[PDB]
Amino acid sequence: MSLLPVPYTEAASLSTGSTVTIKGRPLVCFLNEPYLQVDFHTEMKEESDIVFHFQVCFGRRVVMNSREYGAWKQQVESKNMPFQDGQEFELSISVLPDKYQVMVNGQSSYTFDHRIKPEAVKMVQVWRDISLTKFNVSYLKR
């Protein structure tokens, strides 16, 4: 169905029990090393701080970090690569009490402990070398 704009920006609120659901596909083959980035921002401004930075180099690695008062903190690097060459992916990011949990196509794949309270989030941006068909933030919980 219909392609969403990329870069994709949605005003957002997160707390324990929130889920962020993303369906998309890499624009090109893994040999060409397309990226995916998901940033949970503290303001609508793109230069604002990032509570949770998630950056996939498809076929190679994933880095997670925070950007706090304009400065990148301690990088976490994973070689875990559940994404499949040439395939649509479904990404879901759950806000648990102590961490973000990243599911890829239904499989727990990455976690990242909260450095800043999730309530600081005001915006989610999804960008780099993908098409997007679906984006949702859940708002069911108190």
Interface contacts to a copy of itself, rule CB under 8 A: 7, 27-29, 31-32, 35, 39, 46-47, 67, 70, 127-129
* Residue 47: CB minimum distance to a copy of itself, A: 5
With CB under 5 to 8 Å by kind, the binding choice for 75 among ligand BMA, a copy of itself, none is: ligand BMA
CB of 106 to a copy of itself, least distance (A): 28
Structure tokens given for 111: 């976690």
| Residue ranges that bind ligand BMA, judged by CB under 6 A | 33, 63, 65, 72, 75
Question: What sign does the dihedral 103-79-62-3 (CA atoms) show?
Answer: negative
| Residue 53: count of CB within 10 angstroms of its CB | 20
User: Are 11 and 103 a contacting pair, CB within 8 Å?
Assistant: no
d(CA 45, CA 48): 5
What is the nearest approach in angstroms of ligand BMA to the Cβ of residue 75?
A: 4
